[PDB]
From a paper:
The phospho-MurNAc-pentapeptide moiety from this intermediate is then transferred to the lipid carrier undecaprenyl phosphate (C55P) at the inner face of the cytoplasmic membrane by the essential integral membrane enzyme [name], generating the penultimate PG precursor, lipid I. The peripheral membrane enzyme MurG then transfers GlcNAc from UDP-GlcNAc to lipid I, forming lipid II, which contains the basic monomeric unit of PG. [name] is a polytopic membrane protein with ten transmembrane helices. Our characterization of this and other related [name] variants supports a model in which [name] is feedback inhibited by the accumulation of flipped lipid II, limiting the synthesis of PG precursors when their supply exceeds the synthetic capacity of PG synthases.
The cryogenic electron microscopy (cryo-EM) structure of the YES complex containing wild-type EcMraY was recently reported, and this methodology was used to obtain the structure of EcMraY([name]) within the same complex. Focused refinement of [name] alone in the EcMraY([name]) complex substantially improved the potential lipid density at the [name] dimer interface. As in previous A. aeolicus and E. boltae [name] structures, this electron density fills the hydrophobic cavity found at the [name] dimer interface. However, we uniquely observed this electron density extending into the periplasmic space above the [name] molecules where the environment is more hydrophilic. Although structural refinement could not conclusively identify the lipid within the dimer, the size of the electron density extending into the periplasmic space is consistent with a large head-group such as the disaccharide-pentapeptide found on lipid II. Notably, the T23 residue lies near the dimer interface on the extracytoplasmic side of [name]. Consistent with this possibility, tyrosine at position 21 has an altered conformation in the [name]([name]) structure in which its hydroxyl group forms a hydrogen bond network with Y227 and K358 on the opposing monomer. Substitutions within these residues were also identified in the screen for hyperactive [name] enzymes, and Y227 is in the periplasmic helix that was found to be altered in the MD analysis upon lipid II binding.
Residue numbers in the entry:
A (entry chain E): 1 to 58, 64 to 121, 129 to 360
B (entry chain A): 1 to 56, 64 to 125, 129 to 360
The structure:
């Protein structure tokens, strides 16, 4: 909404016209997100630890008694930055915001219950995802805004009907749960989110313009040009939160922020018609989901286990790898998958 | 060199024009450097363990080889030679600077750890002579050309043309970047990931200065046969990341002057060829801040006699204040990344 002020007051001073330039707005959104996250930092963690344990005053590596409600930091940063430097008239930004808010409140309720139910959370996630997908499908009737996009191929673009809603629901809920289970280690489920959000900012910017949209064969969405601000704000908020959520994590991520960020990533993926690009980019989350699935399947099928623990990060941590080593190694893996995914668009 | 192989085998390998297309070869170079580094990591760390100490505890401070930057050096050089055009002089200038700094660091670390001694100022003399030679060669290449005009961001209006001052600027930037990367290596992994970010930003800029249309759009000096520096920057990114695989907080292998000085010189020289020294300062703000902090505390302890930081490098200051090492590492990676983004954004507004 702050950009609206810039254009409504550019008449008196013509220098405000720069605020409507997408790159400048994106950079300012990044900076606003990080600065908000850092400003609502130590005070917020102090409040959370007072509420959870009472004794405000806090060995380091063997951390204990750290707050587990830090995702409200990400929620506030992302929402404030988006509402400040993104056009409210866009329905796409509002769809992203409603998905973030819904998943964040779901996780917040879950963590509040924990500090003071699977079916309830699953049902709320499913209903919100289904509603969002239904609205998006109603908008995109027989339009390249609802055609499936596959890498390494441009002749095939199978238009979707109810399969569009089905795939939207799968991608959104699967990404949300994948980030929820990737929370296993502190700092592991934010930097991959930052890298994927940056990749999606680049992709969304490529979708916005006519020339690049036609050059890369990416489907054109007129309203997708403003998702750059949301993606960049997600990047900024993720970096700001990682400032505290390092191996000696001052504040744990918790579900309240994890589910919100997973839903945000999935929703950016679906609105851009880039589910496969999210799978490749966020391949860390997908492979962790596959790991837990394989572990449970082997456990039920036979007495032997594939991994030490169901998630890969926990398995490697117990194998002997220290926590920071595995955290940084999966950061590297996520970065490489992000670059590969971004190249996959150019391969087409 | 494989590009030449594709060029003179395309007559029957129909469809290998892709091997010449710059983004493809850049991504392939990154992957090649990363996978080479990952494949040859364990062997190098094992050999260095059996060499430095003679024989092969969670975060123990001992048993970690110090001169492990041979990994970065070999990865970068092999990737560049295999995928970058050797015809152009820019890639070879970067390669020679990198190899010279690498051998200087290797000699220093061999004299340090293998002989249990504690090179003295001969390293600096060699640094100066190689930097001056490279700067003189570049100046001889460019006589009253955009390759020597200074680039000042925020103001495309003024671009002073350097004469003999070009050699001085190249000396200052290269030597300062080398020393700053040497200083900021006190922690493990703190001098790599920022190097990866700076190298990626420089890869984007070099791809930007490669094209006439794009260079005109950004009003950056158009440098011929400088688009192949994209391969060198991309291979630096890949090698730095592959090394970081083995150089996280539980450092399986410390990087010594070998590698650290190599990457510092590579960043400085890449800045010199691209004529973006000031942008190099913006991107390596971390290195610059560390160097000026060391100098500032030295001056304070010399004149006033008191100290304002616990230790000369800023990261040492923070960790001794109470910050654990991983927190400092990540809180400097974030700063370096955001400085890279700030510099790249500055590149556009002029």
């Amino acid at each position: 909404m702050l950009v609206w002020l810039a254009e409504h007051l550019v008449k008196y001073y013509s220098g405000f016209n720069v605020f409507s330039y997408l790159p400048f707005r994106a950079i300012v959104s990044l900076l606003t997100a990080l600065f908000i996250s850092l400003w609502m930092g130590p005070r917020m963690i102090a409040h959370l630890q007072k509420l959870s344990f009472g004794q405000v005053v806090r060995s380091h590596f063997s951390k204990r008694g750290t707050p587990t409600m830090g995702g409200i930091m990400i929620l506030t940063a992302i929402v404030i930055s988006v509402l400040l430097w993104a056009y409210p008239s866009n329905p796409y930004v509002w769809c992203v915001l409603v998905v973030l808010v819904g998943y964040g409140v779901i996780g917040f309720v879950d963590d509040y219950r924990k500090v003071v139910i699977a079916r309830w959370k699953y049902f709320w996630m499913s209903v919100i995802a289904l509603g969002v997908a239904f609205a998006l499908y109603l908008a995109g009737k027989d339009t390249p805004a609802t055609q499936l996009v596959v890498p390494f191929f441009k002749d095939v673009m199978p238009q979707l009907g109810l399969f569009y809603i089905l795939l939207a629901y799968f991608v959104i809920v699967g990404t949300g749960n994948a980030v929820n289970l990737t929370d296993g280690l502190d700092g592991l489920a934010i930097m991959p989110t930052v890298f994927v959000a940056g990749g999606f900012a680049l992709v969304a910017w490529a979708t916005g313009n006519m020339n690049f949209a036609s050059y890369l064969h990416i489907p054109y969405l007129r309203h997708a040009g403003e998702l750059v601000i949301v993606c960049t704000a997600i990047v900024g908020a993720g970096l700001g939160f990682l400032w505290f959520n390092t191996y000696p994590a001052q504040v744990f991520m918790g579900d309240v922020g994890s589910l919100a960020l997973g839903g945000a990533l999935g929703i950016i993926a679906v609105l851009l018609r880039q589910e496969f690009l999210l799978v490749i980019m966020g391949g860390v989350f997908v492979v962790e989901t596959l790991s837990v699935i394989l572990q449970v399947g082997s456990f039920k099928l036979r007495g032997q286990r594939i991994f030490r623990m169901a998630p890969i990060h926990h398995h490697y941590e117990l194998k002997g790898w220290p926590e920071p080593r595995v955290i940084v190694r999966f950061w590297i893996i996520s970065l490489m998958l992000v670059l590969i995914g971004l190249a996959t668009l150019k391969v087409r």
